[PDB]
Design an enzyme around this catalytic site. Structure first.
Site, PDB file in Angstrom:
ATOM      1  CE  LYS A   1      -3.940   4.872   0.318  1.00 35.12           C
ATOM      2  NZ  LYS A   1      -2.590   4.942   0.784  1.00 35.12           N
TER       3      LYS A   1
ATOM      4  CG  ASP B   1      -1.924   1.343   0.949  1.00 37.00           C
ATOM      5  OD1 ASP B   1      -2.792   1.323   0.188  1.00 37.00           O
ATOM      6  OD2 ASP B   1      -1.447   2.550   1.746  1.00 37.00           O
TER       7      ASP B   1
HETATM    8  N1  LIG Z   1      -6.141   6.112   3.019  1.00 38.55           N
HETATM    9  C1  LIG Z   1      -5.809   6.945   4.077  1.00 38.55           C
HETATM   10  O1  LIG Z   1      -6.077   8.037   4.275  1.00 38.55           O
HETATM   11  C2  LIG Z   1      -4.593   6.159   5.163  1.00 38.55           C
HETATM   12  C3  LIG Z   1      -3.805   4.982   4.698  1.00 38.55           C
HETATM   13  N2  LIG Z   1      -2.903   4.365   5.476  1.00 38.55           N
HETATM   14  C4  LIG Z   1      -2.224   3.137   5.115  1.00 38.55           C
HETATM   15  O2  LIG Z   1      -2.093   2.139   6.059  1.00 38.55           O
HETATM   16  C5  LIG Z   1      -0.966   1.922   6.253  1.00 38.55           C
HETATM   17  C6  LIG Z   1      -0.813   1.280   7.786  1.00 38.55           C
HETATM   18  O3  LIG Z   1      -1.353   2.399   8.584  1.00 38.55           O
HETATM   19  P1  LIG Z   1      -0.086   3.303   9.646  1.00 38.55           P
HETATM   20  O4  LIG Z   1      -0.908   4.627   9.678  1.00 38.55           O
HETATM   21  O5  LIG Z   1       0.998   3.221   8.974  1.00 38.55           O
HETATM   22  O6  LIG Z   1       0.119   2.620  10.910  1.00 38.55           O
HETATM   23  P2  LIG Z   1      -0.140   1.029  11.376  1.00 38.55           P
HETATM   24  O7  LIG Z   1      -1.347   0.621  12.192  1.00 38.55           O
HETATM   25  O8  LIG Z   1       0.413  -0.211  10.218  1.00 38.55           O
HETATM   26  O9  LIG Z   1       1.015   0.928  12.389  1.00 38.55           O
HETATM   27  C7  LIG Z   1       2.584   1.203  11.790  1.00 38.55           C
HETATM   28  C8  LIG Z   1       3.410   1.346  13.068  1.00 38.55           C
HETATM   29  O10 LIG Z   1       3.392   0.163  13.786  1.00 38.55           O
HETATM   30  C9  LIG Z   1       4.704  -0.879  14.031  1.00 38.55           C
HETATM   31  N3  LIG Z   1       4.897  -2.252  13.886  1.00 38.55           N
HETATM   32  C10 LIG Z   1       4.360  -2.759  12.682  1.00 38.55           C
HETATM   33  N4  LIG Z   1       4.439  -4.111  13.023  1.00 38.55           N
HETATM   34  C11 LIG Z   1       4.838  -4.304  14.241  1.00 38.55           C
HETATM   35  C12 LIG Z   1       4.879  -5.525  15.004  1.00 38.55           C
HETATM   36  N5  LIG Z   1       4.671  -6.750  14.580  1.00 38.55           N
HETATM   37  N6  LIG Z   1       5.067  -5.267  16.401  1.00 38.55           N
HETATM   38  C13 LIG Z   1       5.321  -3.893  16.738  1.00 38.55           C
HETATM   39  N7  LIG Z   1       5.092  -2.704  16.216  1.00 38.55           N
HETATM   40  C14 LIG Z   1       4.689  -3.213  14.855  1.00 38.55           C
HETATM   41  C15 LIG Z   1       5.702   0.088  12.902  1.00 38.55           C
HETATM   42  O11 LIG Z   1       7.150   0.090  13.460  1.00 38.55           O
HETATM   43  P3  LIG Z   1       8.362  -0.242  12.384  1.00 38.55           P
HETATM   44  O12 LIG Z   1       7.737   0.145  11.234  1.00 38.55           O
HETATM   45  O13 LIG Z   1       9.221   0.796  13.239  1.00 38.55           O
HETATM   46  O14 LIG Z   1       8.431  -1.613  12.451  1.00 38.55           O
HETATM   47  C16 LIG Z   1       4.783   1.382  12.835  1.00 38.55           C
HETATM   48  O15 LIG Z   1       5.122   2.413  13.765  1.00 38.55           O
HETATM   49  C17 LIG Z   1      -0.178   3.005   6.203  1.00 38.55           C
HETATM   50  O16 LIG Z   1       1.470   2.970   6.070  1.00 38.55           O
HETATM   51  C18 LIG Z   1      -0.491   3.409   4.765  1.00 38.55           C
HETATM   52  O17 LIG Z   1       0.072   2.588   3.794  1.00 38.55           O
HETATM   53  C19 LIG Z   1      -2.889   4.949   6.662  1.00 38.55           C
HETATM   54  C20 LIG Z   1      -3.611   6.198   7.046  1.00 38.55           C
HETATM   55  C21 LIG Z   1      -4.143   6.843   6.163  1.00 38.55           C
HETATM   56 CL   LIG Z   2      -1.897  10.579  -2.046  1.00 34.22          CL
END
Ligand SMILES: NC(=O)C1=CN([C@@H]2O[C@H](COP(=O)(O)OP(=O)(O)OC[C@H]3O[C@@H](n4cnc5c(N)ncnc54)[C@H](OP(=O)(O)O)[C@@H]3O)[C@@H](O)[C@H]2O)C=CC1
Ligand SMILES: [Cl-]
Ligand SMILES: O=C(O)COc1cc(F)ccc1C(=S)NCc1ccc(Br)cc1F
EC number: 1.1.1.21
Length: 313
Positions: free
Chosen positions: A78, A44
């Site tokens: 997007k 994504d």
């Molecule tokens: N359409 C829209 O308006 C939006 C779309 N999105 C999409 O959704 C995705 C996911 O949402 P997002 O807001 O990034 O957040 P998430 O809910 O996916 O959380 C991401 C965070 O969780 C941590 N993490 C991942 N796996 C683990 C694990 N196994 N144990 C512990 N911590 C973990 C990551 O750390 P680390 O990376 O340091 O390992 C990071 O800090 C986004 O990246 C984007 O692609 C999000 C918001 C808005």
């Molecule tokens: Cl965008």
């Protein structure tokens, strides 16, 4: 569980993908490489995330190594708000394709229902701090997205952050050509979205849950804020199953017939988040997780709230 879900465009979408908002550009390439080595087949993306180039480097190297075939991958991006103009939509899509090293996207979404004044700035403001709207509406922007399917740039189109009346407005658009395939909305146990999910599923739209882990790295995170990964109720369900909390937060939307896109740049976590196919949450586990809803959003923005189309009134 089957590893993929059938969309209203006839394609199958891996129910588990890798998120990339906030993935630093110097780490996201290895992240995506590892993801693919250990079995991920869905990524994504978004232009406003400013890292599509680096995502693309990884995709391309794994294709080159013949670790995977392109048909086996499912890549999503997007359209940003300053590009809700008839004349700006295609260019915006193409910039994304170029950065990703792809010749199509599996899915392209209207990132938000609100159009903003075009320009360099992703959020143009008046001297008093209000976003400066565009007079262009969601119906005219949808028509522009339909054109991208018809041009081969994208296999599917959808919406993101559209409210029920806005999904309805889309579905009731005079002359509608392609229904949205997906509405990607925030969804996790604290914003469980049952009303909007049932409306959307009833209409055959697949819902993708974003921020499934609650986006702990969001830039406006306040310490007082709720934390899914640390919610002990959720940790308990995980222990019972001999799995991690993240593995449960990921399996949850899977069993709601949602797609889910957890983000990580950590190799071990990327492997961990994929090991979600050899256990089942019970019905009781599922209802329990739903009960945690509090109408809490990661993603909202004050400067945008007077916009006629801001989704969350
Ligand atoms: N359409 C829209 O308006 C939006 C779309 N999105 C999409 O959704 C995705 C996911 O949402 P997002 O807001 O990034 O957040 P998430 O809910 O996916 O959380 C991401 C965070 O969780 C941590 N993490 C991942 N796996 C683990 C694990 N196994 N144990 C512990 N911590 C973990 C990551 O750390 P680390 O990376 O340091 O390992 C990071 O800090 C986004 O990246 C984007 O692609 C999000 C918001 C808005
Ligand atoms: Cl965008
Ligand atoms: O938006 C994302 O995918 C993830 O978040 C973002 C990702 C970015 F790269 C830049 C800003 C955002 C923000 S501030 N998003 C929230 C937001 C933007 C616009 C409107 Br209308 C309302 C709103 F709530």
């Amino acid at each position: 569980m089957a590893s993929r879900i059938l969309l209203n465009n006839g394609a199958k979408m891996p129910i588990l993908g890798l998120g990339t908002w906030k993935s630093p550009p110097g780490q996201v390439t290895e992240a995506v490489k590892v993801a693919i080595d250990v079995g991920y087949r869905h990524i994504d993306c978004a232009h406003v995330y400013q890292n599509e180039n680096e995502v693309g480097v990884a995709i391309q190297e794994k294709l080159r190594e013949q670790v995977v075939k392109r048909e086996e991958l499912f890549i999503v991006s997007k359209l940003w708000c300053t590009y809700h103009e008839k004349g700006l939509v295609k260019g915006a899509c193409q910039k994304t394709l170029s950065d990703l090293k792809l010749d199509y996207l599996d899915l392209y979404l209207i990132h938000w229902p609100t159009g903003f004044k075009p320009g360099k700035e992703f959020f143009p403001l008046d001297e008093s701090g209000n976003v400066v709207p565009s007079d262009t509406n969601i119906l005219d922007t949808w028509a522009a997205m339909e054109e991208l399917v018809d041009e081969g740039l994208v296999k599917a189109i959808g919406i993101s952050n559209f409210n029920h009346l806005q999904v309805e407005m889309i579905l009731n658009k005079p002359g509608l050509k392609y229904k949205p395939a997906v509405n990607q909305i925030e969804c996790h146990p604290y914003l469980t979205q049952e009303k909007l999910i049932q409306y959307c599923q009833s209409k055959g739209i697949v819902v993708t849950a974003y921020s499934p882990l609650g986006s702990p790295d969001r830039p406006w995170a306040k310490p007082e804020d709720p934390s899914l990964l640390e919610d002990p109720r959720i940790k308990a369900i995980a222990a019972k199953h001999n799995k991690t909390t993240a593995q449960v937060l990921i399996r949850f939307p899977m069993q709601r017939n949602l797609v889910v896109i957890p983000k990580s740049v950590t190799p071990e976590r990327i492997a961990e988040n994929f090991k979600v196919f050899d256990f089942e949450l019970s019905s009781q586990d599922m209802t329990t997780l739903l009960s945690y809803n509090r109408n809490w959003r990661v993603c909202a923005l004050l400067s945008c709230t007077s916009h006629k189309d801001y989704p969350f009134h």
